[PDB]
Write a protein that binds this DNA or RNA. Sequence first.
DNA 1: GCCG
DNA 2: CAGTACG
DNA 3: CGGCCGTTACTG
Length: 324
Amino acid sequence: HNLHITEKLEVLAKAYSVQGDKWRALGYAKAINALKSFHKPVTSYQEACSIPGIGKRMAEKIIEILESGHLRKLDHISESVPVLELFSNIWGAGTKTAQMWYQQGFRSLEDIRSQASLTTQQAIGLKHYSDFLERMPREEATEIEQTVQKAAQAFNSGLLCVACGSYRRGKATCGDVDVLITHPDGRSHRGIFSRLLDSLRQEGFLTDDLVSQEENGQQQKYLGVCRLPGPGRRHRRLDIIVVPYSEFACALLYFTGSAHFNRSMRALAKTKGMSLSEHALSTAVVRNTHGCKVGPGRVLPTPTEKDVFRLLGLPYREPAERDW
DNA sequence: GCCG
DNA sequence: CAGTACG
DNA sequence: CGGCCGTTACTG
Ligand SMILES: [Mg+2]
Ligand code: NA
Ligand code: NA
Ligand code: NA
């Protein structure tokens, strides 16, 4: 509806993001999102300001795109940006690492491979550079979820496994497959990672681990790489979280996303003196002048996702309606 | 970058 | 801790 | 002025 202007802002948003100006980038992200979530192609200054997420600064920029069909700002983007994007797309490397490598003279992935000091995660990220920038058809996400579920129910058929993220939101393609695991008895979820992960390794499904604290029986998540059997298969990102039944609803809400939806919902909760996380929804939370949680408050009973919305005074939304 |  | 990551 | 999600979860 307004791609002729968002397409340009998205360039700036990305530029600020890779350079580490996270707040400014966030502002652009929201503005661009609004412009997309809109309908009528904005054609007036005052008409832009009247839109939530768009201020005078952004409005002036939109105007220049309709009067000049261009944004002079785009001509002053540092030449380092494309390289910073190239580098930050390595899993495990963010804007600080990208900026450091650029300062050190690195300009290509060949430079990184041959001269950069890589962390264990980054080396895995580099090896799967193209792989991790690809999306898979949702049908493959189903296969991956089933593979994890089968392995889990193999030693405890009572384990409840659910694919979340974009898959649950009904998207045609998925990036990271997100599997949430829990158990109705509220206890059999404890210390099952090592058994589950070892089982998935046994069959050669898991090929590399990015985040997996297996020394601690309190491990909450596994971020890794997997690949289904047979020809024509690519390495995919797999994220698994194991949670106690009492936190099932909040964990499910969190893992289903989207990320921006979660942030919006948590922001709303804070305005109501509450707090929302993947662990729980709490009321009567005590915060300092900086909005930081000082007092825990009381955890509210949230057996289902509907309960979370209800307690927040919000109409329930199907996963497909949380694709923000 | 926006907003309260 | 800072950095990076998850939705 | 100053928050912008989570007293979020690992890594080293
Ligand atoms: Mg995902
Ligand atoms: Na990265
Ligand atoms: Na480990
Ligand atoms: Na370790």
